[PDB]
Design an enzyme around this catalytic site. Structure first.
Site, mmCIF file in Angstrom:
data_model
loop_
_atom_site.group_PDB
_atom_site.id
_atom_site.type_symbol
_atom_site.label_atom_id
_atom_site.label_comp_id
_atom_site.label_asym_id
_atom_site.label_seq_id
_atom_site.Cartn_x
_atom_site.Cartn_y
_atom_site.Cartn_z
ATOM 1 N N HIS A 61 0.817 -1.205 0.000
ATOM 2 C CA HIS A 61 0.000 0.000 0.000
ATOM 3 C C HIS A 61 0.853 1.258 0.000
ATOM 4 C CE1 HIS A 61 -3.191 -2.816 1.014
ATOM 5 N NE2 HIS A 61 -2.541 -3.158 2.113
ATOM 6 N N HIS A 91 5.328 6.943 6.893
ATOM 7 C CA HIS A 91 5.049 6.559 5.523
ATOM 8 C C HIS A 91 4.491 7.784 4.810
ATOM 9 C CE1 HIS A 91 1.266 6.127 7.637
ATOM 10 N NE2 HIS A 91 0.748 6.579 6.504
ATOM 11 N N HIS A 93 1.774 9.155 1.364
ATOM 12 C CA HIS A 93 0.755 8.964 0.351
ATOM 13 C C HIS A 93 1.093 9.920 -0.785
ATOM 14 C CE1 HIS A 93 -1.871 6.928 3.394
ATOM 15 N NE2 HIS A 93 -1.182 7.705 4.204
ATOM 16 N N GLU A 103 -3.734 13.482 1.305
ATOM 17 C CA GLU A 103 -4.986 13.006 1.882
ATOM 18 C C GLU A 103 -5.768 14.186 2.443
ATOM 19 O OE1 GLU A 103 -3.934 9.407 4.267
ATOM 20 O OE2 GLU A 103 -4.802 8.535 2.437
ATOM 21 N N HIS A 116 3.157 10.982 6.912
ATOM 22 C CA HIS A 116 2.512 10.658 8.173
ATOM 23 C C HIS A 116 3.523 10.028 9.116
ATOM 24 C CE1 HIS A 116 -1.629 10.456 6.098
ATOM 25 N NE2 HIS A 116 -1.252 11.685 6.398
ATOM 26 N N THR A 195 -6.388 6.494 8.020
ATOM 27 C CA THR A 195 -6.878 6.748 6.666
ATOM 28 C C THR A 195 -6.834 5.517 5.773
ATOM 29 O OG1 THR A 195 -4.792 7.422 5.730
ATOM 30 C CG2 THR A 195 -6.130 9.170 6.786
ATOM 31 N N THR A 196 -6.387 4.384 6.292
ATOM 32 C CA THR A 196 -6.493 3.113 5.608
ATOM 33 C C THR A 196 -7.239 2.149 6.509
ATOM 34 O OG1 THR A 196 -4.465 2.120 6.478
ATOM 35 C CG2 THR A 196 -4.276 3.402 4.510
HETATM 36 C C1 LIG Z 1 -3.748 -1.425 12.799
HETATM 37 C C2 LIG Z 1 -2.593 -0.991 11.923
HETATM 38 C C3 LIG Z 1 -2.787 0.426 11.448
HETATM 39 C C4 LIG Z 1 -1.634 1.003 10.667
HETATM 40 C C5 LIG Z 1 -1.860 2.421 10.208
HETATM 41 C C6 LIG Z 1 -1.140 3.472 10.758
HETATM 42 C C7 LIG Z 1 -1.295 4.772 10.301
HETATM 43 C C8 LIG Z 1 -2.204 5.033 9.280
HETATM 44 S S1 LIG Z 1 -2.441 6.692 8.725
HETATM 45 N N1 LIG Z 1 -2.424 6.664 7.126
HETATM 46 O O1 LIG Z 1 -1.312 7.438 9.207
HETATM 47 O O2 LIG Z 1 -3.747 7.079 9.178
HETATM 48 C C9 LIG Z 1 -2.944 3.999 8.721
HETATM 49 C C10 LIG Z 1 -2.769 2.705 9.195
HETATM 50 ZN ZN LIG Z 2 -0.970 7.605 6.227
#
Ligand SMILES: CCCCc1ccc(S(N)(=O)=O)cc1
Ligand SMILES: [Zn+2]
Ligand SMILES: OC[C@H]1O[C@@H](O)[C@H](O)[C@@H](O)[C@@H]1O
EC number: 4.2.1.1
Length: 257
Positions: A61, A91, A93, A103, A116, A195-196
């Site tokens: 992703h 990470h 986006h 985002e 993020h 957000t995922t």
């Molecule tokens: C339960 C694992 C979740 C990992 C996860 C961590 C951060 C984001 S974000 N894009 O920063 O909202 C999304 C997913």
């Molecule tokens: Zn993110």
């Protein structure tokens, strides 16, 4: 499984993650005129001097740069936060073109990408317990625009060739995330979600107003990554962003007058 394509993207996620239609979903559009300065916000403290990066992973992703979170090292405190939040990973986006990829949006404007930095509230002991709590996480979001290169990003860019496909990882020790920050810590904040998937409503969002500039060449290398695994048909890892979600019963607060 979930992804960003026409058949498995954000408009489908609610079928397996009904909280996708919840009351505090992220990202949101930040209407700068309606956001209100909040004098109750304490000074924000980004304390990354002792950060210990470990590894970089293509998870199908995005790519995550992971940190040792077994002790208070890199932490975020202050601002809207009660207590100490420990950095676990960062990470990005990003888009297929420079005109999209973020985002959050700012008065509807989309940036080329968004960083993020993900932190968990140490009062809950472990990230897994933190994502059961309404104040379990704090994500520091930083917009990227295309212009001059960001020197502190180049080590990330240069390792991406070694993690092209889903499931690949590489050592990524001694990376200093301070090199990804802008000059100003002015920010907006609001309560939201991951957000995922699983889209959990655990996050205090802190979105910096000042973007960082990265070069076209840097972001073009993000776009050479693959969503697919080794040996499978190539699907470029681009447009891995969720669009803005309804604000519902929320207010965005500003740290600056
Ligand atoms: C339960 C694992 C979740 C990992 C996860 C961590 C951060 C984001 S974000 N894009 O920063 O909202 C999304 C997913
Ligand atoms: Zn993110
Ligand atoms: O009742 C007045 C209050 O309304 C709230 O919605 C605002 O967040 C506060 O800043 C304001 O003082």
């Amino acid at each position: 499984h979930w992804g960003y394509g026409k058949h498995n993207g954000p408009e489908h996620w609610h079928k397996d993650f009904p909280i996708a239609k919840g009351e505090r979903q992220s990202p949101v559009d930040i209407d700068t005129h309606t956001a209100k300065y909040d004098p109750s916000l304490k000074p924000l403290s980004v304390s990354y001097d002792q950060a210990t990066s470990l590894r970089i992973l293509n998870n199908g992703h995005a790519f995550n740069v992971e940190f040792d979170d077994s002790q208070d090292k890199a932490v975020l405190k202050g601002g809207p936060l009660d207590g100490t939040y420990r950095l676990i990973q960062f990470h990005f986006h990003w888009g297929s073109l420079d005109g999209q990829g973020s985002e959050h949006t700012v008065d509807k404007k989309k940036y080329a990408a968004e960083l993020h930095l993900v932190h968990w509230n140490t009062k809950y002991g472990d990230f897994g317990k933190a994502v059961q709590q309404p104040d379990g996480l704090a994500v520091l979001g930083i917009f990227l625009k295309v212009g001059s290169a960001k020197p502190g990003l180049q080590k990330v860019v240069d390792v991406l060739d070694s993690i092209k496909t889903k499931g690949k990882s590489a050592d990524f020790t001694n990376f200093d995330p301070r090199g990804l920050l802008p000059e100003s810590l002015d920010y907006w904040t609001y309560p939201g979600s991951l957000t995922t998937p699983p889209l959990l409503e655990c996050v205090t969002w802190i979105v910096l107003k000042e973007p960082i500039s990265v070069s076209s060449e840097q972001v073009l290398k993000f776009r050479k990554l693959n969503f697919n695994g080794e040996g499978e048909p190539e699907e470029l890892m681009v447009d891995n962003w969720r669009p803005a979600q309804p604000l519902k019963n929320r207010q965005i607060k500003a740290s600056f007058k």
